[PDB]
Amino acid sequence: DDYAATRYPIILVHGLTGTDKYAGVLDYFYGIQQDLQQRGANVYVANLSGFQSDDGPNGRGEQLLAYVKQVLAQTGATKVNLIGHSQGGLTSRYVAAVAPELVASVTTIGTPHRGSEFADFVQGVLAYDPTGLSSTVIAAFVNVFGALTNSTHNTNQDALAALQTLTTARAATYNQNYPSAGLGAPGSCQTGAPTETVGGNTHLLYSWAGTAIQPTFSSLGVTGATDTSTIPVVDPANALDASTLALLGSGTVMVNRGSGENDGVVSKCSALFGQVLSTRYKWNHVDEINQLLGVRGAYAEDPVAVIRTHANRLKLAGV
């Protein structure tokens, strides 16, 4: 049908580690492009560096800008709708700021607009490196993974730059460099406006967040956490998707670093942008993109349906 048939093409924009198709065979947005296309959407999936900053000449922002231009040339469209997961939301903001005339809307899903306490932790660990050797080797493992799994074997991979980009201090600088009316004041844990107009160009702004990881008890400087996406103990997702227990673990570190409710790597507060559609989804960070391979806890919403409904929302809004 035409339920998801927006006026302007949709570009899905992956985050950290990503590519359009891992090893050319596994979609980052698992099941989603196919679903949208069945419902009449014109959908493209960007293929960017899995590991990079968003700004800078070699960063993901300029990569996405180039891809946007290709999509416009291919389709004859004047603008695109950007839907970004995680760091892809930051990349989408970059393009909306530097080429506002090419963008109709920016939607961010689990995007660390204010950075990640987990990134701060990892960076803090590497700060103890006396020489840079350990850091260089760690980065090399990650960079190799990026080049190996990128669908076109993109070798523009910089794990240390990516890490820095997702820290809270760097994200604050990014927001000063690339402001948006969609952002609330730093420190407020509030969202901004549902639209922006930039250089004569209006953008509709949206976001949602996953908050599977919830703080529980608090005693003597220790905070507990629970994964509300899963049946306690014996949810199939604990067995069949390694990311489930992993993101509970990272999410527990996060709550102990003052994050509050989170998806395993991004806090609710960090994810707030534009019109906040919901922050209540019982999703960890990769459930938001229907990963791994469609495996989700029993209490998780269906992200395929959520994104489909959003495509319809965009259509109704005139983009």
The two tokens of residue 211 are: 């908050």
Torsion of Cα atoms, 140 then 66 then 9 then 147, to 10°: -20
In the 8-state DSSP scheme, what is residue 232?
T
Site membership for Ca ion, residue 117 (CB under 5 A): no
Q: Could you tell me the smallest distance in angstroms from the CB atom of residue 245 to Ca ion?
A: 11
For residue 27, give the H/E element and its range.
strand 26-27
285 catalytic? Reply is yes
Q: Which is nearer to Ca ion, 27 or 241 (CB)?
A: 241
153 catalytic? Reply is no
Site membership for Ca ion, residue 62 (CB under 5 A): no
Q: Could you tell me the smallest distance in angstroms from the CB atom of residue 286 to Ca ion?
A: 6
Size of site (CB under 5 A) for Ca ion: 4
Q: Could you tell me the smallest distance in angstroms from the CB atom of residue 319 to Ca ion?
A: 30
| Segment near Ca ion (CB under 5 A); pick from 10-18, 95-103, 269-277, 284-292 | 284-292
Question: In 188-274, where do the E strands start and end?
Answer: 195-198, 201-210, 213-219, 222-227
Tell me the per-residue interface mask from 295 to 314 with Ca ion, x by CB under 5 A, - otherwise.
xx------------------
Q: Could you tell me the smallest distance in angstroms from the CB atom of residue 243 to Ca ion?
A: 6
The alpha helices in the chain, defined as continuous H runs, are: 32-38, 60-75, 87-98, 117-126, 133-149, 159-165, 168-177, 236-240, 242-255, 268-271, 303-316
263 catalytic? Reply is yes
Q: Could you tell me the smallest distance in angstroms from the CB atom of residue 240 to Ca ion?
A: 9
Q: Could you tell me the smallest distance in angstroms from the CB atom of residue 226 to Ca ion?
A: 16
Site membership for Ca ion, residue 287 (CB under 5 A): yes
Q: Which is nearer to Ca ion, 64 or 289 (CB)?
A: 289
Distance CA 294, CA 206 (A): 24
> CB-based burial of residue 219 (10 Å sphere; 0-12 exposed, 13-18 middle, 19+ buried)?
exposed
CB-CB contact of 34 with 7 (8 Å) = no
| Segment near Ca ion (CB under 5 A); pick from 35-43, 53-61, 159-167, 288-296 | 288-296
CB-CB contact of 282 with 263 (8 Å) = no
Binding residues for Ca(2+): 241, 287, 291, 295
Q: Which is nearer to Ca ion, 120 or 235 (CB)?
A: 235
Among 20, 85, 263, 267, the one annotated catalytic: 263
HSE-CB at 317 with a 13 A cutoff on CA atoms is: 20
Among 85, 113, 203, 285, the one annotated catalytic: 285
Site membership for Ca ion, residue 288 (CB under 5 A): no
Tell me which residue of 91, 85, 162, 90 sits closest to 123, measured CA to CA: 162
Tell me the per-residue interface mask from 175 to 204 with Ca ion, x by CB under 5 A, - otherwise.
------------------------------
Q: Which is nearer to Ca ion, 170 or 296 (CB)?
A: 296
Cis peptide before 314 (omega within 30 of 0): no
Site membership for Ca ion, residue 241 (CB under 5 A): yes
The binding site for Ca ion (CB under 5 A) comprises 241, 287, 295-296
Q: Which residues are catalytic?
A: 86, 263, 285
